[PDB]
Amino acid sequence: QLLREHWVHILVPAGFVFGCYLDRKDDEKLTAFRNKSMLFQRELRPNEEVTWK
Amino acid sequence: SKYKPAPLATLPSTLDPAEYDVSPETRRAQVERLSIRARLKREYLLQYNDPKRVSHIEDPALIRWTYARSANIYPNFRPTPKNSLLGAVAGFGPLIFWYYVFKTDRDRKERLIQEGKLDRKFNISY
Amino acid sequence: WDKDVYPEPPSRTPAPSPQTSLPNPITYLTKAYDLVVDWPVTLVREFIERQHAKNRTYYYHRQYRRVPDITECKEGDVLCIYEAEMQWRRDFKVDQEIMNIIQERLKACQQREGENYQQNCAKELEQFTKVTKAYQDRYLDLGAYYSARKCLAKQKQRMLEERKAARQ
Amino acid sequence: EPYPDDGMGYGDYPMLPNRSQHERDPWYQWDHSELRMNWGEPIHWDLDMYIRNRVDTSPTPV
Amino acid sequence: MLKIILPSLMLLPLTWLSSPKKTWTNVTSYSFLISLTSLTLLWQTDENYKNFSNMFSSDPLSTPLIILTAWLLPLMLMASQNHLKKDNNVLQKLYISMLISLQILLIMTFSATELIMFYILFEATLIPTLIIITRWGNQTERLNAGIYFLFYTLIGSIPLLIALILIQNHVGTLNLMILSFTTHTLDASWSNNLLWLACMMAFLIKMPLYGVHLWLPKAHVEAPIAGSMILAAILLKLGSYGMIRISIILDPLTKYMAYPFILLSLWGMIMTSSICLRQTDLKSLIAYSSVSHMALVIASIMIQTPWSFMGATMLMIAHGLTSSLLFCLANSNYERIHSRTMIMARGLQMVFPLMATWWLMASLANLALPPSINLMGELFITMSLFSWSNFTIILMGINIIITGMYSMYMIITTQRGKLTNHMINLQPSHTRELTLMALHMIPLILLTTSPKLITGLTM
Amino acid sequence: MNIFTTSILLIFILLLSPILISMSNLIKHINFPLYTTTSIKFSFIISLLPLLMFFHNNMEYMITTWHWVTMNSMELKMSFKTDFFSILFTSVALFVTWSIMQFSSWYMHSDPNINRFIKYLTLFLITMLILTSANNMFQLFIGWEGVGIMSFLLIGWWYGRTDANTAALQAILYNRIGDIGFILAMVWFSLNMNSWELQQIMFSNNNDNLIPLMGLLIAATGKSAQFGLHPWLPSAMEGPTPVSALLHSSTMVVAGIFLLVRFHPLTTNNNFILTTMLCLGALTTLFTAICALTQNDIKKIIAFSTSSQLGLMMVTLGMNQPHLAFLHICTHAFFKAMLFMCSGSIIHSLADEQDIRKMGNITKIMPFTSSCLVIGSLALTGMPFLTGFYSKDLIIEAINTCNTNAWALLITLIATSMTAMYSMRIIYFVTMTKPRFPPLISINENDPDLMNPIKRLAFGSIFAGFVISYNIPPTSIPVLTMPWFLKTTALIISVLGFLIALELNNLTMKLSMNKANPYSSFSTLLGFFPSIIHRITPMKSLNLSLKTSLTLLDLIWLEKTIPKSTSTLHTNMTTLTTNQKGLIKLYFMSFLINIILIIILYSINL
Amino acid sequence: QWQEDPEPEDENVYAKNPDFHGYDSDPVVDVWNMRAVFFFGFSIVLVFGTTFVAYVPDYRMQEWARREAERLVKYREVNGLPIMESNYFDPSKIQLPED
Amino acid sequence: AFCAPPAYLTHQQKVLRLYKRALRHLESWCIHRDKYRYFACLMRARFEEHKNEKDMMRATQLLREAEEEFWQNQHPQPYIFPDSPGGTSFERYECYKVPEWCLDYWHPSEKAMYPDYFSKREQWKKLRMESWDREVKQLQEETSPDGIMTEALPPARREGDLPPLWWHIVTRPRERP
Ligand SMILES: CCCCCCCCCCCCO[C@@H]1O[C@H](CO)[C@@H](O[C@H]2O[C@H](CO)[C@@H](O)[C@H](O)[C@H]2O)[C@H](O)[C@H]1O
Ligand SMILES: CCCCCCCCCCCCO[C@@H]1O[C@H](CO)[C@@H](O[C@H]2O[C@H](CO)[C@@H](O)[C@H](O)[C@H]2O)[C@H](O)[C@H]1O
């Protein structure tokens, strides 16, 4: 097939997807204060487990 | 003559005493200058009309001028009392002058504001 | 458009009262305009609004609850200071827009009163002056790094000066 | 004729008369037409000041 | 921010794994896509600056510079496609790698949250720049130019490192947000004055300041086109950005420590705008215009007002675009006639009618034609300085007149007059070159349309 | 109002349409000059409607079209201020530009890039309208700067010339020297009133205003070419005759007068600024009226006439008569554009000859152009009941019946006489003589593109002053009670100037050699102001920029002081330290010295 | 003299391949590089980037601030309170140092 | 313009140049044709009075006095022909004077719009190529032994030879393109 010349067109998109994943992980690490700020301190609505995940 | 030349209104040529001297020395000098002009023009025209030429004509005189005005200024600079005095004055004197101007203005303004006498009316942006 | 925020006096147009035999070109030009230009545009706008009536959606003006001020929590508590600083920045951004609203009021009054602005824009000019003094006392002379702490320091210095003068 | 040896960086460069390009012969066929200079001719130190667009030093009736 | 950083890293393996024919196409296209992605930083719908993690952040001051850095790299790659036409494929890929590594480091620098990380990256950018200048310059003075560029920065940077270490020892952290929120006044002791100088000297040298600018004309004259582009566009703004960031903890000493540098910048802007009137090298003329323009940024940041900061940011962005456009325009003629002397080429509008239009637009932006963001920044800096002292208007007006004069002189000398007919090698303008100029100009027009994006922290 | 605002915006839309068409391929399929001329014509017709409404109800509008950006308590929004001045000037300028755009289709027919020429003229019209209809000082400045840039691009339309490039850059320089004052006014108003809109500025009536008013006065001096910054306008004749007719006479040069008129309410209460304006205008009037005499170039004479008239407008503003000054602007546009068009027709018909010493007998060889030229000349002079009259007569009456500088008044009257003097110079040397032009004759007025626009401008120069003076609302209270001599001074001095110039011109045919006169040379060589300033100022400035900043400081001393000094110091230390002989004897002697030093250190430190 | 190569001569790029776009000597690679530049630079980044930036909503609370300002102006004028008061912080909250 | 100046002008040349300038400035002073003719006849009478002067020192003295008088009485603003240096429309048409070599870069699509013109142009270029070697040889052999050279160029001496350095003199842009 013609893969040996076009496979190289997955690096940068893969980098972007991996960066989005790493950003989500960094979001997870800072979960503290999720619903505990003086502002934005509403009670969870029914069937709601996290304010902004 | 009633026309007195100035550095920015140079003496004409028809009023120039040196244009009416027919001495063989000056005549030889003028002929030599024309010979130099002719040789340079011949070389330039040969290059200009060369049908195999594929680029512009480099100008040694222009290269020399740019080199002299840029890269050769420092190698041929020697500090002297006049050089040092001029350098210090030009470099700093304007700075000291404008420092005093700005500082006196700012100090007077600040004294006015401290005393409350400055009429800051619709000043809102600063 | 809310008239209470943006007061626009009632118009006082005089009656035509023509006193000549010639026809007024502007009346016929306005008739031709109201026919050719004003009517198809009105129909297109009505169609657009009819389409908007369907697929109608609502958006809300966000409300922020007051949080503890800068004065209300301790030196070096970055959490408190961040909350109070964001609140102060919000209030400062809103003060700027109130300033803008009153400046628009003043400019519209000047244009409207026209030649009587020296006498019939007294209310707007006085409002501008008073609100301008308030703005200056609040925010003027704070650095490009203005912050709730600098505003508090400025207010406390002004209060100390006022108190000293009152004592004397 | 070189510049005076006052150590101002001129070095070996010649000193040509301080005459604007306006004064060169306008009917001649100069190699550098608007500079009114020939190819290879030594260039004045202040040529860019004396070009026909800038400082003019031509004689005057008064 | 990692969603911008990581694809930039992946550009490098793409460069080294792409076939020799498709390398330029692939790298340029994906750089353009990364530049598009970087626009996600403009989605700020509140006053709460973006904080992605403990290590990266974005504010109204950082986002414009990050987007400009992301945008420039495709332009540099395009500009470098001709003078690297003869080099080996390994060498071309090495050059692409240097440019990509510069982009990554600059984006990391502008997104940094800690002053020490800022320092590490802001000094890491030197290696790619030195390599680009020295390994791909055309004249024998590129080595000395690189030495100047390196050591002017290093000498000023070491005191910056000492000051940062001292601040971290005293406070316990270097996080910019913590420093801003827990900032306290500085006693006016001699040690604190020396701390102020150590904090500001590196950035002032990078700006550059009037007395220590000799490294910039050399670097621009000896650098390749991409080197000049990135330098003028971003590496000068590193100093202004650092000054804006670090001045938040140096108050109130600024009020009296800014006089020497305010005066130096105000006078040196005139003294360099004047040099632009009688500079023979076109690249040197552009470099000195940049020095004079950056004097304004220095002065405005020093006086520190809501207007000064916004004007400084707007002028930073506008100069970043305009100086790069001017350098590309000059390099277009250089690649044809192989001389930087301005007098050598004349009447070029008779053979490049559209390049002359680009020249005119670039020059008008340079002299600040309203409503251009150039003039927005310059006007607001002028107003802030006028409020500072009412006699600054004299110097500002002199500089304005000189700027108009030299800007129009460039055009009249190069694009107008009688064509230098002896130049048979003036080939028609490349589509690549015209696209480069268009990509430099269109963002300027759009930012003029929407200037709210390039205001700074203050407004 | 919908109709009024729609007309105001549609004028700009129509003007912008040709600019957009020039960026598409349709410009090759259409006749671009004719399309642009039609666009200007329709813009004029549309603009005639707001003019009628203002004449009827005398209402003025503030129209905010677009919110550009808000800058912390200062909103910059595109705003148009449509009042008496803007409404009247828009119509006058559109009429003049319609005529000149039609004329250029003929004058520049041979010249390639006529499409670019038409686009440049349209751009200048757009920018001038932006300037004249703008609430914000910032939008006014956009127009102010774009007008100068289009002036640069048009002066030296033939960029092959070097004189043309010098004239264009001269215009740019002399206009930036006034843009400094404009920016001074902008910054002062921004700081002290926190706004650039005239509505909010108006509440600065009771302040000092000396600084902002002086800034505006410097800007007006620069832009309208008052005595201080005047050389550029006479030198702006390098460009095409249509450029001269439109920009540097009919519309561009009146920008400073328009700015002062716009800010008139503030300068009403500042006696210093009014006195300065009066004196400056009187000086400019006298100086340029003198310079116009003894000028052997039709375009140069007309340019100096324009400068003199602008000086008169500045005198009118020095007196508190802003409405009268604007009325003179509007009236003068007509006949000045007509005069320039007629001169262009003469120059085109002759083999591009501008010197009047090679013309003559045009009254017979070109009846139509000669008649239009004489109409324009009499209009320029105070011929009763022509477009010039309803402004010049009232200006002279107000000058006489006011508290004014005696010298300003006297030299203003002398200049009013010199106006007729140089008009008679043109008439005599270009009409009332024997033919001095080359022997082969190829003169053809018969072309509609030439004839029609001049006919329109002639109807203007005859009736527009009357129509406007009657339609405009009452503005100020004139003084109509004065001695017979004060009332008739305008006519008397104009006729005296005509007769004196006629006698002097008749005396030229006498076979007596004309000897050079000191005053004749002062007039001819423009008072030596160019010859001296344009040589001393640039020479000193450029010599400083090279010998001081670049050579002395940047290339020499700033190298010696920092990099070279540091490098030399460390190159000296390295050679001092690394010249070791390589002898263990000396190395161990040094080690012994080190040991002794350490022992001493410990001993004295305890 | 050392054994050095001579200076290469000036080339006309359009001499061969008069459809040269400045990108590459190979015509196909050149045209495709030009197409990629024009597509990803103008069609993608500039158009879509401009649209996205334009439709960023309420950029930095510019609109919310104006709506709040209108609300507060109406409320304060209806209730008779000052539009803006010279003390941002209620002076009761502040404990001024004695003397 | 076509001829190159000599190393120097002779007395006759200087006197003739002075005569031409004096008559032109006299025409500028006397606007009218009849007056100009009268005064020009008088001026020629003055010139002729000293047409015979074998004291080549009293000739130079007369010339210098005349030049002083000319600089004293010259028109401050003389009359310049529109196309001459200093006259309006001097270099007016230098924008449209595109040199011939610009046609080398025309796209084949653009040359297809003038099939015959470029057919003849190829013949002209072939002629230039054939001639160049012979013309450079002619100049090289014509070079004078003594260094006293001039800008004057030789004509074609043999047959089928073009004059040396002819390509730029020919093919120069037309005065009114
Ligand atoms: C304010 C603090 C920040 C400013 C700090 C300044 C430190 C800068 C030091 C950079 C050192 C530059 O070191 C530079 O070395 C080069 C070698 O290429 C020397 O190069 C030069 O040397 C001498 C002239 O002196 C010549 O004979 C030689 O041909 C020339 O190349 C420079 O003379 C020297 O200046
Ligand atoms: C403030 C502390 C900072 C210290 C560090 C800053 C960096 C300083 C670098 C010092 C070294 C510079 O090294 C520099 O080398 C160049 C050549 O390369 C020398 O250049 C030399 O050129 C030739 C010989 O080659 C000699 O004729 C000339 O006199 C000499 O200058 C410089 O004289 C030397 O100064």
Short mmCIF file of C-alpha atoms and ligand atoms in Angstrom, two decimals, chain B residues 74-75, chain E residues 143-145 147-149 151-153 155-156 201 205 211-212, chain F residues 559 562-568, ligand 1:
data_model
loop_
_atom_site.label_atom_id
_atom_site.label_comp_id
_atom_site.label_asym_id
_atom_site.label_seq_id
_atom_site.Cartn_x
_atom_site.Cartn_y
_atom_site.Cartn_z
CA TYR B 74 36.26 52.49 14.09
CA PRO B 75 39.62 51.03 12.96
CA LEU E 143 30.39 35.56 14.06
CA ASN E 144 31.09 38.85 15.83
CA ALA E 145 27.41 39.78 15.57
CA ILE E 147 29.10 37.10 20.00
CA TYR E 148 27.63 40.55 20.66
CA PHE E 149 24.07 39.23 20.68
CA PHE E 151 26.98 38.36 25.60
CA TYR E 152 24.91 41.54 25.74
CA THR E 153 22.14 39.20 26.88
CA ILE E 155 25.80 39.94 31.09
CA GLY E 156 22.41 41.46 31.83
CA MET E 201 18.69 45.36 33.37
CA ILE E 205 19.20 45.21 27.32
CA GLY E 211 22.86 52.87 25.48
CA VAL E 212 23.04 49.10 24.98
CA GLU F 559 31.59 50.90 20.94
CA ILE F 562 31.20 49.20 26.68
CA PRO F 563 31.97 46.24 24.37
CA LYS F 564 35.43 47.28 23.17
CA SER F 565 36.51 48.37 26.65
CA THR F 566 35.33 45.12 28.24
CA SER F 567 36.99 43.02 25.55
CA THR F 568 40.24 44.97 25.89
C1 LIG I 1 25.61 47.21 30.24
C2 LIG I 1 26.10 45.81 30.32
C3 LIG I 1 25.86 45.06 29.05
C4 LIG I 1 26.91 45.38 28.02
C5 LIG I 1 27.94 44.30 28.06
C6 LIG I 1 28.91 44.38 26.94
C7 LIG I 1 29.68 43.09 26.85
C8 LIG I 1 29.88 42.72 25.41
C9 LIG I 1 31.14 41.97 25.19
C10 LIG I 1 31.14 41.39 23.80
C11 LIG I 1 32.54 41.16 23.34
C12 LIG I 1 32.82 41.51 21.92
O1 LIG I 1 34.15 41.13 21.67
C13 LIG I 1 34.57 41.49 20.42
O2 LIG I 1 35.40 40.46 19.94
C14 LIG I 1 35.67 40.71 18.59
C15 LIG I 1 36.13 39.44 17.93
O3 LIG I 1 35.11 39.06 17.09
C16 LIG I 1 36.65 41.90 18.43
O4 LIG I 1 36.76 42.14 17.04
C17 LIG I 1 37.49 43.24 16.62
O5 LIG I 1 38.68 43.34 17.35
C18 LIG I 1 39.58 44.35 16.94
C19 LIG I 1 39.05 45.75 17.27
O6 LIG I 1 38.98 45.91 18.63
C20 LIG I 1 39.96 44.28 15.45
O7 LIG I 1 41.32 44.18 15.33
C21 LIG I 1 39.27 43.04 14.85
O8 LIG I 1 39.54 42.89 13.51
C22 LIG I 1 37.76 43.09 15.12
O9 LIG I 1 37.15 41.93 14.72
C23 LIG I 1 35.98 43.12 19.08
O10 LIG I 1 36.87 44.14 19.19
C24 LIG I 1 35.40 42.78 20.48
O11 LIG I 1 34.57 43.80 20.86
#
